[PDB]
């Protein structure tokens, strides 16, 4: 290296704001793009150590390289203030989050080349950064079907199948993250269920990435269960379990429209259905017209079964003669 450049890199790494400011304003020969033993220039060192004051001073320079990689590094470490400061750079005007812009050295990029800022922020589940990027139009691209035979997919398969499959799992790791699920869609519970099913299907189709897709579908199940765990009153519980009761058709004979619960059972969420908030609603449906029999012990219920067994012809006779009756209403209950 050089004495001037080494001093500049040392000052930019260790937060020596006055020295870097003086060198930026007084040298005219030191190049801002000088790199250290690891190929990290002043901006990457300042971002890596979370030096916001040095970061802004460097960003005010015009010929500063590795700005996109600096944004990616700031996103991966959290550093909300530095991320916003870098987003203030003119290179990200109106959006760059949809070549070689994110390279961290002459050859290569710090992360996988398909990982854009929105995907990286979703991976780290930085809720503040994800909210910022979503507000600017950043979206994860929803990769096509595994057996899609279109031209764009076919070109990626021929160029590199290893990188194309890794790009697909990276996109799904971003979509399946709770940070992206809750902030991107109006109905995160509906989206999490459908994405959980899709990732479960892809685990069987892709044997190579079966463990990854099973892990991601478990994240969507965990999000929906955790979303149900926060409910505090019956109105919020019904909004998670049943859905939009206003636009739902209805449940049969006054029941709470179990369509979403049926979908959860099909997708084997296994923890959303087994949750105490969900079990309470199903138990009320189970003992539909038998309020007193819920509290009775198991011995009483055993005697009820024997009593029904002895009087079984009488109950059948009642159902034929008087379907719309006190006994007919009770018999149609799921527990009866």
């Amino acid at each position: 290296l050089s004495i001037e450049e080494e001093r500049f890199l040392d000052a930019a790494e260790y937060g020596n704001i006055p020295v870097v400011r003086k060198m930026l304003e007084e040298c005219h020969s030191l190049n801002v793009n000088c790199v250290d033993y690891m190929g990290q220039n002043a901006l990457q060192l300042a971002v890596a150590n979370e030096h916001l004051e040095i970061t802004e001073l460097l960003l005010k320079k015009e010929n500063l390289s590795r700005v996109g990689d600096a944004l990616l590094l700031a996103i991966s470490k959290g550093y909300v203030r530095i991320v916003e400061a870098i987003l203030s750079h003119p290179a990200f005007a109106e959006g760059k989050r949809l070549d070689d812009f994110y390279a961290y050295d002459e050859d290569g990029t710090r992360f996988s080349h398909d990982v854009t800022p929105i995907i990286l922020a979703a991976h780290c589940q930085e809720y503040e950064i994800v909210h910022t990027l979503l507000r600017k139009g950043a979206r994860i691209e929803r990769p096509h079907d595994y057996f899609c035979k279109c031209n764009d997919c076919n070109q990626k398969q021929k160029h590199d199948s290893f990188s194309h499959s890794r790009s697909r799992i990276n996109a799904y790791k971003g979509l399946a993250s709770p940070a992206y699920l809750s902030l991107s869609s109006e109905d995160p519970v509906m989206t999490a269920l459908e994405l959980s099913n899709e990732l479960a299907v892809l685990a069987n189709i892709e044997k190579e990435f079966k463990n990854d897709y099973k892990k991601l579908s478990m994240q969507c199940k965990d999000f929906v269960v955790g979303l149900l765990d926060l409910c505090r009153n019956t109105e919020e519980v019904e909004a998670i379990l049943n859905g939009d009761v206003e636009t739902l058709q209805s449940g049969d004979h006054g029941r709470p429209n179990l369509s979403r619960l049926k979908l959860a059972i099909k997708y084997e969420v296994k923890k959303f259905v087994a949750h105490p908030n969900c079990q309470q609603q199903l138990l009320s449906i189970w003992y539909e017209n038998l309020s007193g029999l819920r509290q009775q012990t198991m011995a009483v219920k055993f005697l009820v079964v024997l009593a029904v067994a002895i009087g079984l012809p009488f109950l059948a006779l009642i159902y034929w003669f008087a379907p719309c009756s006190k006994m007919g209403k009770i018999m149609r209950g799921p527990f009866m």
Binding site: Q125, Y127, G226, L227, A239, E246, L258, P313, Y319
Partner: protein, 100 residues
Amino acid sequence: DADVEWKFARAKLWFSYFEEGRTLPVPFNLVPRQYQKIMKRLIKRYVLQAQIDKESDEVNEGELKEIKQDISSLRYELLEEKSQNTEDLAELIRELGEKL
């Protein structure tokens, strides 16, 4: 996970009888915008709780270093600041001494 596995099996059992379906047993069946408001309320509550749980994670070596670097930058800012404060000040007093 056994408790969760059984409760799902019981719930699948319940949904069998939820349908109107058949009421008589085997021997006798031969004979003939508040929702949008609540979702916004719960999504925000999820974000706050998710951030609380992230704050409940143990501190690592990387996080403590970012804190260490903060102290390091503060030292450079304050030492230069006070040194600059006296240099400009003593220059003014030097002008005062020249005026006499």
